[PDB]
Amino acid sequence: RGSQLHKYYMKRRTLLLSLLATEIERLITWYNPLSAPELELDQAGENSVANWRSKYISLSEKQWKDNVNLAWSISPYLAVQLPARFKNTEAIGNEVTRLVRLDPGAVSDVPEAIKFLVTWHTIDADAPELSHVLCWAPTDPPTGLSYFSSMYPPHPLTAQYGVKVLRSFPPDAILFYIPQIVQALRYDKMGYVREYILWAASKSQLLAHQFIWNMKTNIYLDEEGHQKDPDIGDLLDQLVEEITGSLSGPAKDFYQREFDFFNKITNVSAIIKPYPKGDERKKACLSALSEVKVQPGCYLPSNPEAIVLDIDYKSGTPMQSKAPYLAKFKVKRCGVSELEKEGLRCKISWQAAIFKVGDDCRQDMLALQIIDLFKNIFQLVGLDLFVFPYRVVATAPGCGVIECIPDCTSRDQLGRQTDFGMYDYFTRQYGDESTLAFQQARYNFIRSMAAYSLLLFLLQIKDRHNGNIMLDKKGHIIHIDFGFMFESSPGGNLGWEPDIKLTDEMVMIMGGKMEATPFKWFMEMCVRGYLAVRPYMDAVVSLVTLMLDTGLPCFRGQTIKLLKHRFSPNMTEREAANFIMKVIQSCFL
Amino acid sequence: ELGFFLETGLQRAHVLYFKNGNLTRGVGRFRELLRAVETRTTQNLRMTIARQLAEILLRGMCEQSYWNPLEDPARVYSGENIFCPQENTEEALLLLLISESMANRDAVLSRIPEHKSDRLISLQSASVVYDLLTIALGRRGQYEMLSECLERAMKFAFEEFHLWYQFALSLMAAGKSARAVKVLKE
């Protein structure tokens, strides 16, 4: 019977042709971001591929579910990976979900296949049968944490799986995601999260310190603090009174010493407030700093991977403002586990810390977490983008400690000193544009600017004036003061400010003409970065969703929809490149 | 809302009957007790007597020592579509099934906010009823429904070796391999 084998080969030939066409289109799109008419390949092959794509893009709802059935007959892994090769049709997902529900035991690859079974219904919350998720391999922490938010109704099996996946990671990874864990208690109708928190606090040591430092601030709502939240305030009080006292021995002594030292170094800001501006305030601050002594074993809360060595008794300098000041320490870097073991028995640089009283320090944590995630993604991909994630930790209501970047140089001060464009400053600093140092500085500036512009567009950051951008010695540009984001906008949401700030001086740094080669480098770098960062939407969505009930002024209700829309999840690569190029060019002049 | 005198004065009667050895009178009294119309407030005590019957009807008689209730060895449920018991295994399985179905909805869902006694009592009751079910059903060489029942009961077990071991053994005896290997590893 030759017809059977004939059709058996024809179907597979058609499917292979479609897959090859899609892959070739993706590769050629990745080759050159712009149109690049100078670069060209074989015309006949491109025309044939385009014709085949046009032919296959017109398929109806039928004759495509049969393709999914055929792929499942070939191999379940291919069927699972099929929706990754984007097809602008919703029947593929429904058919895959039906097939995986019919037989869940055929797949055990967790990073993609779990989401086709976990949500039997998004909000309907019915049919509690055939759900056996007690065998899947562990996945990323955000996926596990997503089960405790408002996205899904509570269920014992999902909570058990979340606890199990959360209990299979090193302590540092859990330390990274501290605020989400404590915020998850709001929707935690059960007590699994509380038991996990108690177990983790009992197991390690620094995790307990981070937990207490975070939970001390979150009990109140206002900056100064006079109104406890009626939702989880009592639960937080019970948890904090339960966790303390249980510890004993050397750990208790370590905790007492650390907290006493922090209180002694913190009370100076409150003490210095009554004295007015003048040299008397400076000398009183110096005397107060000299009063405090150095206690071995202490560590900076913002840098839990270093051991303080000593304090400089002449670096005190309060700034304008609320009585904040600046401090300098001489510190040694050892590590984490070694520091943890050495704290129970008793490469050296200097650091500067800024203590702020009376201001919230929670949005900056989200901003810096997202920046760190983007940096990790870019480093893994293999591109060249430079970002500096300085650390900051809030310890008391309205009280926080902020790290200072080495060799701070504010743009506003340089502008006041010079009253000219940065091009003249760079020419004076390094020399003519024909030297190698100028070329390296330009390359570093482009590297920093591309990533920072992409981030600024993606997160919709407003209020970016000349007094916030920071310039280093090499040439990189660093942003700071991320107070306004998402929806908050000073001035009354006027909206005339562009998404990306591009003045004339920064353009003429790149040659001043749109046809200059450095500008093309910047454009292609931005396009490649935007294309590379796209497939990680779910993690960012979950991270920003889990903290919607903190009542920050930035959130207004519609953030999730706009944030998801700005990622364009139903788009092909070439269309995405066209969109990003258009939106970048629209912001120029 | 406080039943204090009827419960003792009715239960210790058949307790003394069992002590003396009047088995026929006690089993007839149980049969006529089970024929009453169900009451939502008494469901708990129902559990007890049902389980008690499952304890005695499997260890106190043989096939030839069974008799129809209509002869010696207001409204009452009747009809022709009712399921008339035929053998001890039939009615025993029926009682165990209804008891498990009614006890699944009364679970405490392992609330564990600060207290533990209620969850411990619920877990003990579930364990004993499922052990009775598996010993009753495993004798006939019917394993797959036992695997299904243990899968249904899997909700309670979080750090209990007994339930995991029983489920793994039942799955391996049924014929499935991959799930058996995974539960063995766990």
Swiss-Prot record, chain A:
Region forming the signal peptide: none
Region (Activation loop): 479-503
Tissues expressing this chain: Expressed ubiquitously. Highest levels in placenta and brain. Little or no expression in lung, liver, pancreas, testis or leukocytes.
Location in or out of the cell: Cytoplasm; Cell membrane
Variant or mutagenesis effect after changing R257W: In NEDSPLB; uncertain significance
Ranges where the PIK helical domain occurs: 54-242
Residues of the PI3K/PI4K catalytic domain: 330-589
Function: Acts on phosphatidylinositol (PtdIns) in the first committed step in the production of the second messenger inositol-1,4,5,-trisphosphate.
Family: Belongs to the PI3/PI4-kinase family. Type III PI4K subfamily.
Subunit organization: Component of a phosphatidylinositol 4-kinase (PI4K) complex, composed of PI4KA, EFR3 (EFR3A or EFR3B), TTC7 (TTC7A or TTC7B) and HYCC (HYCC1 or HYCC2). Interacts with TMEM150A; regulating recruitment to the plasma membrane. Interacts with TTC7A.
Protein name: Phosphatidylinositol 4-kinase alpha
Organism: Homo sapiens (Human)
Species lineage: Eukaryota, Metazoa, Chordata, Craniata, Vertebrata
Part of the whole protein covered: 1477 to 2083 of 2102
From Swiss-Prot, chain B:
Protein name: Tetratricopeptide repeat protein 7B
Organism: Homo sapiens (Human)
UniProt KW keywords: Cell membrane, Cytoplasm, Membrane, Phosphoprotein, Repeat, TPR repeat
Cystine pairings recorded for this chain: none
One GO-annotated biological process of the protein: phosphatidylinositol phosphate biosynthetic process
GO CC terms of this entry: cytosol; plasma membrane
Signal peptide: none
Residues in TPR repeats: 7-40, 127-160, 161-186
Function: Component of a complex required to localize phosphatidylinositol 4-kinase (PI4K) to the plasma membrane. The complex acts as a regulator of phosphatidylinositol 4-phosphate (PtdIns(4)P) synthesis. In the complex, plays a central role in bridging PI4KA to EFR3B and HYCC1, via direct interactions.
Summary of subunit composition and partner proteins: Component of a phosphatidylinositol 4-kinase (PI4K) complex, composed of PI4KA, EFR3 (EFR3A or EFR3B), TTC7 (TTC7A or TTC7B) and HYCC (HYCC1 or HYCC2). Interacts with PI4KA, interaction is direct. Interacts with EFR3 (EFR3A or EFR3B), interaction is direct. Interacts with HYCC (HYCC1 or HYCC2), interaction is direct. Association with the PI4K complex is strongly reduced by TMEM150A.
Location in or out of the cell: Cytoplasm, Cytosol; Cell membrane
